[PDB]
Design a protein around this ligand. Sequence first.
Ligand SMILES: COC(=O)[C@H](Cc1ccccc1)NC(=O)[C@H](CC(=O)O)NCCCc1ccc(OC)c(O)c1
Lengths: 514, 511
Amino acid sequence: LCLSQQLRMKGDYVLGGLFPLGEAEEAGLRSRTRPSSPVCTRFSSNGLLWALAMKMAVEEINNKSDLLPGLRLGYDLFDTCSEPVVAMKPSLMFLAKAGSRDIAAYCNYTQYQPRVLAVIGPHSSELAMVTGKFFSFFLMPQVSYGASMELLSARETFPSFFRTVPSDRVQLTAAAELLQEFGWNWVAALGSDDEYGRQGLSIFSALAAARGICIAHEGLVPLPLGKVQDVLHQVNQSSVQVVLLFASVHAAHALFNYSISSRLSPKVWVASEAWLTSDLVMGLPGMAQMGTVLGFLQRGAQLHEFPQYVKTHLALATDPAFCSAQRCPQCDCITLQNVSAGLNHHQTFSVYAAVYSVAQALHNTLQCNASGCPAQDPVKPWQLLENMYNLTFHVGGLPLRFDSSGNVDMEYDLKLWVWQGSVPRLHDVGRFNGSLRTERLKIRWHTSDNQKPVSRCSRQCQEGQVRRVKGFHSCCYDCVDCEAGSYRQNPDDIACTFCGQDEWSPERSTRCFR
Amino acid sequence: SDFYLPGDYLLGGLFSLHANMKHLNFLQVPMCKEYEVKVIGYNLMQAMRFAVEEINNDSSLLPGVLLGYEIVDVCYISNNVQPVLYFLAHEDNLLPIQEDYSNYSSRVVAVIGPDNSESVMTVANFLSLFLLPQITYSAISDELRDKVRFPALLRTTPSADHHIEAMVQLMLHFRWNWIIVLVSNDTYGRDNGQLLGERVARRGICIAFQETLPTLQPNQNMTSEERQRLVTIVDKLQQSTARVVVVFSPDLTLYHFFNEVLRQNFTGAVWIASESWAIDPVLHNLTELRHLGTFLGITIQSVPIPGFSEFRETCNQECDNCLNATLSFNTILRLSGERVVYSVYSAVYAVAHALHSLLGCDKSTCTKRVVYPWQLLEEIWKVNFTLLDHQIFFDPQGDVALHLEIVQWQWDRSQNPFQSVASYYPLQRQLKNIQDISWHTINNTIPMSMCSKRCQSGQKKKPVGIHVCCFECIDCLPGTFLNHTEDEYECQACPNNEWSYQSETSCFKRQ
Ligand SMILES: COC(=O)[C@H](Cc1ccccc1)NC(=O)[C@H](CC(=O)O)NCCCc1ccc(OC)c(O)c1
């Protein structure tokens, strides 16, 4: 095959592409003696799948008759091995002066010209942040797929950033609405002890405080360990039936391994998107009695032509005649099974949508008539920036819409794990599109009584009950009575107080009488 | 001008001269004079200048090699990126890309890096591609110990872990079992708060209350929400029993917090400052704090630099208001001993000696050659020598083992306004040599903060759940006794032949 040579295509305007084509070996994060970077020799399927999605999008956009008429759109892909140093060189090349080897350290950029019009950003949020600082100083429009962190939404740090996946806050607000509507006022929350779980737990704590639902404690669990037992002890001791496990898949797998190893109590688990896919966790046999698992997934139309497109283009890459027409030396070795193993990945749709969004934004910026665009002084990024901030664009059907938040609008499905055998199976139990349209009747609860497990606390008391509070920020009452005869000298105070043997008073009293 | 000096090798300097918390504008690079000037940043910049000037004068090591410097202002998170490119670019201010940079000579040989952790990491993510050595002063965050992720970075300051350890040991020495934690709404607050939470849990301390502050601009005109927020914070501070407060915040945002509590009149607290504001002249200028409680803070050792005071008296190079702003506070900063100034000084001297040994130089007699920054980075690890009575060398993590002080604020300006009450040794991980402390209490009795008073004799513990530090006490009933020697939480039942005197530790015979 010849496939690496296809990774670049000339055009009147060119889109830079970042994808994780290679992955490092165990020691691949080498302690380099000299500046030049490693090369991640191990191939990975998902990078090529996403790159193919982008190539399909660009080819369709070139074939489109009314978008960008008479304008030929190119692409320029590069590898990002999930590591900043590898990523910096291709981004530097993206921001290099047109047709040149170099990038200029000017004091003003009113006449500068980078060689690419826009960059299809990296997959992970770490690369998203690091490359976003650099790109957004240059005001380069960066559209990213799969970068979910809400931290990236700040326009006072990332002015030119966009993404075609919901930010984490949408998921967490749907979760808060779920907890509110089912009446689970008293809950425990867990984040994975990485930036993902850490930031997500911060966001969820802020939302919980804003909605009165009470956090027992802000737990964080290790990634790959000896402190998870203490966290699980805290959750057991806190007397909670609802636990929000917002964690990376490895940390959730470790936690559940220990949980089944500890015969943990059955509890309702609310799941983040990533863990819920549960390719790892769904294998353990005892999972069927670990409790109830609920979670969310966002809904978008499948990129149905992609499998046939991959088969067609890898057939073309097999034909030596077309090869007559190098940055990924791993790619040319790959047989088709490696790609077939993941020929349905849903984020190909997000990549496709990002490319279409940039193409539509350029069409609008040119003010182009569908019959043909005007002759124009070549466009530059900061001109795309001001047009993209309120743009609507179709993806097949499904008109999407950016706003100042940088996210695309989206809606979610609430899903539940139904059990047959050792296999859980996903079934829909409601919709969320900013408010929760629960289909309550379908739920199966883990308790044999099959009626909803309670987890709540009060914000009310009988007058004589002591003022006392619990929760991470005093979000619950736990007031309690006092015995008869004895009286609390102040109901706004703790100390129940006493009198002589010939004196009496009611229960929960604040007075005593001879 | 003052910000540049030609030489055979150039040090790149990054200092935060104007640092208001509030990208290109009209496709031109920002300029920071519109923000408020920071006294300490200008002081540290002048400290670097003095160090390089002395190295030029000092005939003991270099063979007449002129060590130049070039200083650009990293205005906190802003004004970033561009200085790194300006350092990396060649003599024509253009930067050609290569597959391998090992043959490329940058315009600066080393970088005296930013102070804000965010800027430090942003610059390091660039320089890691070139392995250009970066030494950052006062950037305490322990993120920077992830060396595989930041190979080129070194520090002349202990990490945040030592600061939190010093705070914990201070609290334990005085048995402050019950504390309040306040954090700013950013990474500096959040990361340090989580680190403190973990350190607290292990050692027998309890965080009674924890809250985020609003990030007010220092001359903000208060919004309704901000005003109600601050008064809510002071209400929560008033209700809880602890008078010991830990504050993780930038200096600017605490000004109006103090102004607000100075109208709530909630005096008598023990304030423990994090190093971000422990030595701030601007906050300490407020004479009102003399009546607000007792102030303690953690900071680097004062090391007396000889002659520093007498020395003190292409974008956005210049500052003007810095001089005027220094004129008045020179009153404080002459009495105040060089603290962080020593971190900057030792960074410059470390690079100087690393360069001298890289050239293998005999006394003032050796050749001059092109130096690639990766070799200088390789040699910087290996320096080991005394600078001003303190030996400076780098741990495998890149930190330098400088001592830390806990300083108590003083308002009698006839003496040093910051008084050293203790010394912390990082190699030993021990707080040591505690001095006399002037408390707010009527007889200078050590101030107190615990969730509950210790139980009387013959009582078992009764925990109230929310914290391990909080427990009531129960008198042992007849037929049981307190075996605290083996178990504190339950009165053990007496042998079947014997009885007990209610609240007592031992049994007796009865019929
Ligand atoms: C991170 O939060 C912060 O903004 C604070 C305060 C700050 C505000 C604006 C610009 C720089 C720092 N940062 C720190 O305290 C860092 C730790 C880190 O940043 O990792 N240690 C610096 C101690 C000596 C110091 C030097 C320069 C000063 O003014 C430019 C200053 O006031 C204090």
